[model samples]
Target: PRGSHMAHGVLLEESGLDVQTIPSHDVLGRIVIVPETDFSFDEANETIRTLARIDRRILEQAANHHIYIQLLTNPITDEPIARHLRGKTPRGYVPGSKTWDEVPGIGGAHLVLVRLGHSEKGKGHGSINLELHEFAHSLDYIVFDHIHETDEFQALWREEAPQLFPREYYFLTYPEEYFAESFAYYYVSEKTQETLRMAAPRTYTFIRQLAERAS
Candidate 1:
């Protein structure tokens, strides 16, 4: 018994949250948070602090769950996630492509994958926490052991954050994809996240719980 990382392994086993106990034979039992980084991107510390303060508290729900979060810089894949934004000016990275499992070490860590931009580094926008989007994927991983379980995937994810998600993206149409994209949307748009929370308390609490699971 050294730390919660491994020390609590047995206790975790006693708890249903422990993957080892879940005899589904499909649970890989790994949770990580990888960050996209560069020498210039220094806002990571502050972003992590905000996540720790606001979201980490929610993770306690799974006492036996194993979560490993890391921040790193992937120099090669920088062109797409960071330099290329869908509409706005390119400032930070988004995350891995849908085919991420193909990458080495990506599975080891949750892959927060941040973008290093002059704008993001300067904190001009409250978007440093872009990693929160990928963290949402991690949350899905935490909640449902299987990624593609059922039609509920769409419902559980998209509508889960009604006030937060804009009717713009396929989230209105495709809930499964919407849930993942919505996380990225919130990471970049503080206005949307808080506005939704203020407008809809129930929905906010539900989404906040999901965000906490990311921590």
Candidate 2:
């Protein structure tokens, strides 16, 4: 039952904010502000909207996984979560960074942090796509049970490897990152899709089939 869709798993069973208080844009999943920010309430709320807008599929997948989004005005306040994002570009942690290793008991249901102040759209540094990528990690935890290490995922990676590389470049270095990055681009980047199709048609179809099956 580790990956079964239980009604009250570690994630779904845990509670956060009052659902009614969140803005309309956070229609995908729960959004919580850690608070006491230099940014105004409007800015904070708008940030949630933008994160939600990253991709409808991200929001939908997040909802399916019962993942909740957390916006952090100050990362240090929550050292465990903060370390997960620290020493890294807003695009996210390095390809094989162990920054998250120290965070104790990270597998439990809880808020996935989004540190504010990075550019709204980062020079295509992949910053704006953070939420989607992070949410994909949440799915890796809840649904796939870390399938990235399994032979099943390895076979899938072999199929998609060529197209994912050179395009997302980092994916060439880290195959696990490919799933998260692909999840983001599939929902948000038309250019990435075209590249994936033109360069790796089989991979594109493979991703589509997996995503549809998940849906």
Identify the candidate with maximal lDDT: 2
- lDDT of every model, 2 decimals: 0.39, 0.50
Q: How do the residues 83-170 of candidate 1 rate in per-residue lDDT, one tens digit apiece?
A: 3333332322354422232121112123334333312322322323344544555555664453423454444554454554455444
**What is the alpha-carbon lDDT of model 1 when measured against the actual structure?**
0.39
**Model 2 lDDT, residue 132, Cα:** 55
lDDT of 2 at 176: 64
User: Candidate 1 regions off by >4 Å?
Assistant: 1-41, 60-64, 76-111, 118-129, 143-167, 180-192, 198-201, 210-215
On the 0 to 100 scale, the lDDT of residue 212 in model 2 is: 43
**Pairing residues by index, what is the TM-score of model 2?**
0.57
Angstrom error at residue 34, model 2: 6.2
Where does candidate 2 have its weakest 10-residue lDDT segment? Answer: 6-15
